[PDB]
Design a binder for this molecule. Structure first.
Ligand SMILES: [K+]
Ligand SMILES: [K+]
Ligand SMILES: [K+]
Ligand SMILES: [K+]
Ligand SMILES: [K+]
Lengths: 175, 143, 37, 207
RNA sequence: GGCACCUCGAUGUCGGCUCAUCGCAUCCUGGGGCUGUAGUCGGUCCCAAGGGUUGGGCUGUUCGCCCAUUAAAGCGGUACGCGAGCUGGGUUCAGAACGUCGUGAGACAGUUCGGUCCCUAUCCGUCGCGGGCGCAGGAAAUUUGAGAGGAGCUGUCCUUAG
RNA sequence: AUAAGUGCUGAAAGCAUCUAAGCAUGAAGCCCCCCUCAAGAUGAGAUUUCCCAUUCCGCAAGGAAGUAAGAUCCCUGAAAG
């Protein structure tokens, strides 16, 4: 596990605390993330460098080692820099609008689709055709972005729908 | 010459078995043995020589493999197409006492005496049982 | 989807994987999507 | 959940304000009383037990006298539980009167359906006759008992027997009119069972 | 079809009627992938057996063709389910006839007209209804719900919107 | 809660990857929700209320006899059969 073995530099503004049962809490400027890992993994913190160690070269351990390392890296990046996912509404009359904390999507249904974000996730609407999901947890940012994309996933005939920013939607010719 | 236990001679202890972290089958085989009274030298085939068993923490019983999802408890209602099913997961969550009872019931003898032996099993979801009056001893599984 | 006993790379960009113990191809070409069944 | 007990007087009919003709049933419901309040502590579920219909002190017994004593009312010919009711809005002794309901209020309505006695699988099971002609010796028998293979009849082969006298609940009937000087409801439609038979009216389960 | 293993001191045979029940290799309805899927329609494959799945004309028919419907008019198993439940048109007794073969008596998966369908249910099973005892005193009511059964279908129009 | 399906994050395998750990979504179907039966559920459940500890033998065990609360016979009947 090249990924697992790679060393994780902790920025000065991020504190990683290792609690019992391999529960790591990561605190930084953008908030706190807590996560339990598999017992077998050995997460060390020395001189603002987090290292992960696998007990053996068994299939499971090699896989866990890389995963654990990746997740801790995402937690540290998440509390420091945050994660953002960007969505582009493509379509005639396709518009997003923030109503309080709710995202309201008008995407050519006979009713508007409301999405309420979970705790720790902010949705911004910088333009009527652009939505940005921001948060600390990369998984949750991804989940919400996927949920929003699901309301009207991009179609191939004219690319219409909700897409990720820089998504290459495969296109087919109509008539 | 061979001695025989009977109602006058038999004396039944009460045993508490903690099911927490125990394998469904492996617990159940032992309990079934105690209920039958196979652990006593006075064991007599035609009489119920066994001890009472309380099981506690039935909800915390374990299964290996994918048996939580895959092991199915069928049953038939004796009406046509009356075959119902529950998964082991569904059993363990909602009917943990039934799950153990089923496993043990299948490991006892089947006739009149075997049904009688099953009456001395008492299974409970959580940590507590109401049989303080019977003054039950802990019994560790030999394994 | 193709659900078929034989699952194989059609093009070069086909990529055999295994999910849930089932041999699948995946490929930017959505024609080429395979599962084994 | 609101509920009350009543007797089915019998049907009649009622022009609406629009002038449409409404068939009703007349459920006389001289005030119900609360007799017990079951709780989650005591009984392991929350209910109230209503009494209805003043029974004569001849027709009573000491166990019926004794039980109503807390409420402080005469022995009640009909006693039926209501579950799901708001426990703190009753007290043992409290009277329940038809004015608990309103006109336009939806209700479910229980009774015991009018009994038929023993009946054929035609009437009972809405089965088809055979032919009446054409050399047929099969008029109103209940059909083949089923396949050969099993060597037994399949439980749920439907057969002549005693019909009617079931608990039945009709749902989503309207209250047309409430009269509290008579203790009546008027219910658009026809509810299970005879005249004088015990009718339970509740707020509808599917509202 | 092959074989000839049960039944020749008898295991009634086609079609229909009555009553269904099961499988899913799904006819409709539900959910999907791919499309040589613009839309409306479709094609194909995947999940799905919960429910549903028509009335006639002709023929003993099954089948099939046809008429008119339908969301659909599924395919199979259950002694080609169901004759101690029904029918008895066909097949398959005795009469008679045609064609044909035969010297003939007669014969024909050729045809034609006519031609007796028994049984008071013992047991299990099914559907209802009582009596008994049980349930560590004897009673009168009200109950919880382990468990079981039922229900489960779907059209068209309007609007969204030409 | 799931099927097919769609994924999120994610390594094994520096990439990619719906899966290995982890987290979602998703069928007229499954389990409930709705209707009915149901404690012979011998595992015979619960709650409320009523009666109240009698008289005899028999060493006791137990049996017998009057009764309580309550119910029935018999009788008038139907909304039941
Ligand atoms: K024969
Ligand atoms: K046969
Ligand atoms: K016959
Ligand atoms: K027979
Ligand atoms: K028999």
């Amino acid at each position: 596990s090249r990924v697992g073995k790679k060393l994780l530099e902790i920025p000065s503004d991020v504190t990683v605390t290792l609690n019992d049962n391999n529960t790591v809490a990561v605190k930084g400027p953008k908030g706190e993330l807590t996560r339990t890992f598999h017992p077998d993994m050995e997460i060390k913190v020395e001189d603002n460098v987090l290292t992960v160690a696998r007990p053996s070269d068994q299939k499971e351990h090699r896989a866990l080692h890389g995963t654990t390392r990746s997740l801790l890296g995402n937690m540290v990046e998440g509390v420091s820099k945050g994660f953002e996912r960007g969505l582009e509404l493509v379509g005639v009359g396709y518009r997003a609008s923030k109503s309080g904390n709710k995202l309201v999507l008008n995407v050519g249904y006979s009713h508007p689709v409301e999405i309420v974000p979970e705790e720790g996730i902010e949705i911004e609407v910088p333009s009527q055709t652009k939505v940005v999901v921001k948060g600390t947890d990369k998984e949750r940012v991804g989940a919400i972005a996927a949920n929003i994309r699901a309301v009207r996933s991009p179609e191939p005939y004219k690319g219409k729908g909700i897409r990720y920013e820089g998504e290459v939607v495969r296109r087919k010719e109509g008539k | 010459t061979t001695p025989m236990a009977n109602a006058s001679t038999i004396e039944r202890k009460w045993l508490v078995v903690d099911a927490a972290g125990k394998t469904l089958g492996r617990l159940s085989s032992e309990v079934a043995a105690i209920l039958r009274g196979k652990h006593k030298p006075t064991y007599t085939p035609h009489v119920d020589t066994g001890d009472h068993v309380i099981i506690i923490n039935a909800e915390k019983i374990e299964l290996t493999g994918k048996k939580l999802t895959d092991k199915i408890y069928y049953r038939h209602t004796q009406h046509p197409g009356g075959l119902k099913s529950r998964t082991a997961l569904e059993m363990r969550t909602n009917y943990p006492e039934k799950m153990l009872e089923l496993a043990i019931k299948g490991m006892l003898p089947k006739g009149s005496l075997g049904r009688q032996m099953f009456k001395k099993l008492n299974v409970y979801r959580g940590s507590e049982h109401p049989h303080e009056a019977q003054k039950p001893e802990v019994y560790e599984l030999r394994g | 989807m193709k659900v078929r006993p034989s699952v194989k790379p059609i093009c070069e960009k086909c990529k055999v994987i295994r999910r849930k113990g089932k041999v699948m191809v995946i490929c930017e070409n959505p024609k080429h999507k395979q599962k084994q069944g | 959940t609101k509920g009350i007990l009543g007797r089915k007087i019998g049907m009649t009919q009622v022009f609406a304000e629009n002038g449409d003709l409404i068939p009703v049933t007349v459920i006389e419901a001289a005030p119900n009383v609360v007799l017990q309040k079951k709780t989650a502590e005591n009984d392991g579920y929350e209910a109230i037990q209503l009494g209805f219909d003043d029974k004569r002190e001849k027709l009573s017994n000491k166990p019926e006298k004794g039980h109503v004593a807390k409420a402080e009312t005469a022995p009640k010919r009909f006693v039926k539980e209501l579950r799901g009711v708001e426990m703190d809005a009753y007290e043992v002794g409290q009277e329940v009167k038809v004015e608990i309901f309103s006109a336009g209020e939806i209700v479910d309505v229980t009774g015991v359906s009018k009994g038929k006695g023993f009946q054929g699988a035609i009437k009972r099971h809405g089965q088809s006759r055979g032919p009446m002609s054409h050399g047929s010796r099969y008029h109103r028998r209940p059909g083949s008992m089923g396949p050969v293979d099993p060597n037994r009849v399949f439980k749920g082969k439907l057969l002549p027997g005693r019909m009617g006298g079931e608990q039945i609940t009709v749902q989503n009937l309207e209250i047309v009119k409430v009269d509290a000087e008579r203790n009546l409801l008027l219910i658009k439609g026809n509810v299970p069972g005879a005249k004088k038979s015990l009718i339970t009216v509740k707020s509808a389960v599917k509202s």
